[PDB]
Assembly symmetry: D3
Homo-oligomer: 322 residues x 6
């Protein structure tokens, strides 16, 4: 045991979505391991190692679907583990954890700035862009395009149940970007006036499928019907290593009361069930490009990003297992 | 000029959606004419006739998209106009208005029952049915399938911005039918487990397109993707005669405060526009059948229903114009 | 109650597929009703009427999927019933039965000849044609185009489990048409070289779907994939009136021993089940035209054949019912 | 014999395409029969009848693909024939021919004006319309839309080999309509900025296929890919009766030297063949509506226009055969 | 010149399909080369080298379509050839042959086990799986998912003309997996109820096409129609190196008497030809993933398996050539 | 600053299309640098270097869309820049420019031959091949197929506005190959009889899209519709490196007088604009393979060619910028 309160508070804030967005959650988890190592009262390497193992498990068991979270945890603990097994002493192990965490956080920020600069080259002056949910990676693209002087407009879908569209609409409007807010249902009706679709990712699989906020796959479907480019802005740590060896991504089922508030739901007949999937799966055929910090790829090149950057680890257990 | 308060009240309630659903609005318009004729203090036929024309205009000018409304007005008013011009006296004209209105209302009730009987024969034991918005015609189908003892389950989409799915869920649950409630964005995600889609219509056009609650076209699109039958339950007075001669159906744009309540919306910046189309257009390639009170048709036979039942009137002006 | 042995022979032969093919089965039922009438030793009209109702039920209950059978029984019995109810005497009723039967039989032959003539105009010199099962209407198209001097070749699919393709291969070779015989599985491999697909039908529904020998829909699907014309050759009595009011066509499931001979099947373990659907459903989007004895139609005009030839009868009970 | 020179000159001008456009050719053929009857020196009904038979055959054997030509001929000669067989005398037969011709010509003009008014309701302010070849029916639609004050632009495809696009571009520009001229190859590249496609027809078949100028089917294909409405403006006399009974429309193969001028072609190697099909076939699935003078139809309703207006004649020989 | 009888037995058994299945055939060829080496009575290395070149040619020339066979021969002979050319003595060369053969055989077994493990993670409790032919790699996926406690059912297609489905049905039943056996023609009818499709492969090409038992491509086509996952279970030695430099894979045509027994076939007329393709080509757009022993890939990454595992060898002649 | 006349002449000829075809233009640009270095009167390395940079800019600024040009310039100029900066003397820098240019030219010639050899293996005896514009790479494929004795016929599309098909027709005829010449609009009409499509490329992008002569995308579209293979013959220097980082490829808009000659065009009204894009974009879903000098790839592996061969240079500015 001996876990710092910031670890428990971060885990709780991921679970409740007080902190959300797959990148933000990954950085928050890195930031928690960092604070555990900063404040630990461990005397021994053995002790701190075991704390970080435990902190890591607590953070992993918060929300399952966005692989950014375990990838952040892995980034920090592959390096902490290797230091430990190599015989590092207390302060060397501590610094390894703190510095790996800071590396992940810095690289996450840079990757998003770079995704914006790359994706903005695909955005043309006059473009109407449709988006979904709230993705910092997607917003980075739209924001850089606007800063380049391209006169754009963003159609923002409200993204039920949690209303993520409101966040997006207000953020974009605050940079000076003109916004059209519509309900999710209206996505097809307005796909004809749309030039480009720019969305985020929580996990991208080996076969090129993108797992993102519920409703994503519908927008991609009708963008494809209408020949509107579907561009997924996503960091390489959105790529899902275990899909290489056949693993299915768990789709997170969140609380019914996030759809129908508890005051109302309790009055409803028992033979109504409310189902609240937080994500869906978009097949690669409905995706034109994935914009990563290292460049544009077709969706079927996702296996390459995973082979080159993640494959080596799959013959090992997780770096926080005993 | 001497218009009774019920005509005004009916109209206000149509505009505000306190009275809603295509068939219901049609019935209420006929009723309101019925009441104008029952309570008229007119002493001459010309004077009654003039009241019925003005009331028809008030009722016509409430909500555009659902052709059931003008079709109801025409049902009554063609018969009223023929009687006025053939020399009917006051009491004869009055009765023609009342009785035509009654016929329209009664025929509407029977047509929804018959649609149920016919559609229910396409529902099989164990079917998972997805629906959208709240359609009395679609519900008649599902209710009758259940009464025949077929064990069905209905996936009900929330139907933002007005939350029509709530109505549908509770109504279907009340008859004994299990319901799964989902946000609109989840319709693709659950199309794999769906056997049948059953929705209603506000207007059906000469080439077989169905105009229905915003989001309908998305559900039909992914249904077709998945080889799930799309059935549209629709009375013959949902068919739109002006489309035979090239008319485009106006899609109603409703208040943005139905999407974002006024308190919230006034705090938003000027450069976010909220757009709130109440309907969309589903093309005929994504519809398998239309279930009318006269039987099952491919959507491409919408023209036949229009020719044989409404075409005759297209050489004439509206039966309420001077 | 006094049913001649020929009715029972006919029913048994229909059941075992010793008599088969939708047109033939229909003709045999009309034949059976004719012989019941000829050989009846009834003395009063009611006693003959009872025999004919009962013989019709026996015939109707043999094989459910091809509607040609009940359309034949109806052709006769509508006429017999109307005669009986107008107070027809015994010999008048007898002869109505016999003459209505003869007339269905003659018209069926003529219809098949005329489908031949109309269908052959769509076959072009040099054409390679793929067929499925053994359909006398389809063979009529092919035999006629060859008689006009067009150098055609026909690809005959084996049509498991009953090997219908063997019947078709031998018949077509017998007229001097060169045949390529292939297993069903090869239909896609050879679709590239196929110019036209020509198949029959057992029932055609109000929305334009064609129910025909199991496998038909696979062939139509890859035909449409390859932009190869799919032409269905079908008499007007293959159109299914009950589908206008929502009825589903029942797919006959036949004995598993037609797939795996009993001698072999009883050695197999109990946890292997053999499913033997005799028909499948091809949707109308994969059918280019239906060739009837009255002309070429798009599949979507099946509802017109039905409205015009059969819809009158739907408001009544079956003419063999009490 | 005894055919007036205007018959030979008209036939020659159809063959050389000095007169072209399916409507114009049909009116020209009517106008020729008219002038034969006006100027004939026949003494006897028998004589004039036989002249008109012969005039008719000369006109029919000019160009095969646009059924407007035989339909015009039929319009005149069904009535001339019936008069003759009914015993009409010389001047009565003469007037029957002259008046039938004038009827056809007047109705053709009205049908085109009416097609424009109907189709223009489908054109929206701001629309970019793409067209192909030169169709008076299509131009009628675009012209009426512009006269209504809709700010439109027409993308005109050049329509090789004969450059019909130039005619269209100059005609539209002369009404004040802004035009973009592009090569045929550029149709896909500009389909994204296109709102609507409006083209003509030479023949429309029973199954809903449209035969129009070579390249039509490509534009329809990519309009369908991009969800751009394909609207075919066409008079009911563009509908092809013999397709009801299985007839394939001949695709006219015009002279190689219309593609490669003779001065150049003679210098080319003998193993180059130039193929010059004047038309192609557009499947109904790629057509949204057909706009006739009697209203909007889906393409699959073409069989109805043919059943109701032309079927009765198919059991007779042509009205100019012996 | 001195080839042991086991090489000839193996070749004959491959030819007659007494030994069959792409992996098995490959293992048997490696086995045959091993035994030639063990039993050789050669005294010099050149004499053994000559025997092994010749035995390889004998084996290569049995059945052309499955590349597993030449990839096995290559695995051994590349190694044997390199040993020979480095001046290996007789026993060194013998043992290189024997040990290279053993090693291909062991790795093949391991690969199939591991495909099982990786593929099983994509099968979910409750799944209905459709397969085709008899593939040990596909069966490995299915047997493992069942061993993990997932309640699956498998739909086995008959796989004419050789009835491979019987082998598969009995094998799967033997492990306690419930089986539904159907004719090939029924694959579309039952695709609605199928959750996953899992098949093997004989060769996989550089652009991602899968050549497998005749019928495979029909199944994949209607699977994609219905949004059912198509998963191909295939060892890395099913990838076809020669296709990287443009080679087409030859489709074996086998004896017509495998379709129609000789006893029956010689009674048939000469103008019926029986075509018996053993394989067909499924394009990569209809394949969701390939499961190899090194992981899951999109079909489009077949070129990477090839570049990385085999492309080195392409600049040389076959290792059994002179 | 002292630029030789050949650099200027080369540039004029590129702009005017007296020199055209992607590979040819690349070769001519390398040649022009070669000549500048051969004839330079520079006395210092800096001075030569400056000449080569200015010449590179002049050559770069001729025509945008075909990346072969800048790729050729880079080939030479990277090597020149590395030599300048590593201290090379005048004669060493001169030779580096000459010899790099020679290598590029020689490698281009070999690559087109190799592409022929590889592509020709996908062409089968009796194939009808459709091509578009004039591509040396595509022609190498067809020429080699013929030399192998495969009896092929080539459908050559006219390729307006510049009539490139004329060149193609005459060239292919000269080698012995029969040709059918058609207008671009006829490509769909003849896609039924086509076995293979073989075209070239000007640029291939990171996601697998091919930019090629205007109209290419239409032919690929209807080819896919028809299950006709679309093969793109393209050297690795057709691959576009800037697209890895989001760059959009500029489509060249050429003089309208290439479409309508100047004499005609000046007589046209102001409100006709002639638009003349020289290229379009074909998406990767409509391409089956790309045939490079290193082998056959799916279009989705374009990224691999870009990564391994061009990616290294993207951190640096152009090797001709100051
Ligand atoms: N549901 C799901 N599909 C996945 C996953 N990883 C890859 N896929 C692939 O994503 C595709 C989904 O296609 P769909 O079924 O949505 O139309 C399939 O090809 C499937 O094999 C995963 O974790 N979950
Ligand atoms: N299974 C079935 N489908 C029918 C019947 N009548 C009409 N259909 C129609 O056939 C089509 C089947 O399309 P599929 O689901 O096979 O892709 C649907 O449009 C459905 O409405 C019937 O009796 N059975
Ligand atoms: N070529 C041709 N097709 C016709 C004609 N009449 C109807 N069709 C129909 O038009 C469609 C053409 O489809 P496609 O082969 O172009 O993709 C087919 O369904 C065919 O049966 C005709 O005269 N010629
Ligand atoms: N028939 C055949 N197709 C191959 C082969 N290698 C790759 N392919 C590819 O397989 C695909 C076949 O698609 P289909 O024509 O069956 O619709 C094409 O994209 C083609 O380029 C081969 O050896 N044979
Ligand atoms: O009426 P005709 O055109 O001969 O055949 C129509 C259809 O009826 C047959 O069914 P079965 O063999 O009786 O099960 C075949 O499926 C055939 O296509
Ligand atoms: K074909
Ligand atoms: K399914």
């Amino acid at each position: 045991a001996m876990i710092v309160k910031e670890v428990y508070e971060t885990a709780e804030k991921i679970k409740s979505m007080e902190i959300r967005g797959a990148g933000r959650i990954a950085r928050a988890a890195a930031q928690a391991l960092m604070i555990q190592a900063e404040k630990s009262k461990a005397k021994e390497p053995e002790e701190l190692w075991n704390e970080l193992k435990v902190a890591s498990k607590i953070l992993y068991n918060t929300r399952p679907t966005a692989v950014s979270l375990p990838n952040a945890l892995r980034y920090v603990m592959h390096r902490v583990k290797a230091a430990y097994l190599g015989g590092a002493d207390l302060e060397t192990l501590r610094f390894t954890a703190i510095n790996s965490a800071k590396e992940f956080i810095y690289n996450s920020e840079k990757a998003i700035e770079r995704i914006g600069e790359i994706g903005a080259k695909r955005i043309e002056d006059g473009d109407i862009i449709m988006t979904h949910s709230h993705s910092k990676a997607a917003i980075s693209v739209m924001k850089k395009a606007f800063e380049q002087g391209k006169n754009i407009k963003v159609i923002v879908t409200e993204t039920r149940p949690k209303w993520q569209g409101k966040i997006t609409a207000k953020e974009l409007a605050s940079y000076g970007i003109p916004v059209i807010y519509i309900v999710d249902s209206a996505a097809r009706h307005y796909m004809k006036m749309t030039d480009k679709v720019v969305m985020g990712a929580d996990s991208i699989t080996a076969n090129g499928a993108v797992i993102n906020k519920i409703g994503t796959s519908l927008i991609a479907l009708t963008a494809k019907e209408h020949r509107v480019w579907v561009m997924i802005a996503a960091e390489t740590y959105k790529f899902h290593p275990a899909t290489m060896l056949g693993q299915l991504v768990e789709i997170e089922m969140r609380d019914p009361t996030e759809v129908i508030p508890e005051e109302e739901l309790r009055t409803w007949p028992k033979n109504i069930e409310v189902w609240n999937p937080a994500f869906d799966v978009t097949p690669p055929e409905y995706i034109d490009v994935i914009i990563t910090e290292r460049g544009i790829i077709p969706p079927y090149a996702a296996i390459d990003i995973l082979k080159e950057e993640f494959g080596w680890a799959l013959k090992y257990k997780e770096p926080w297992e005993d």
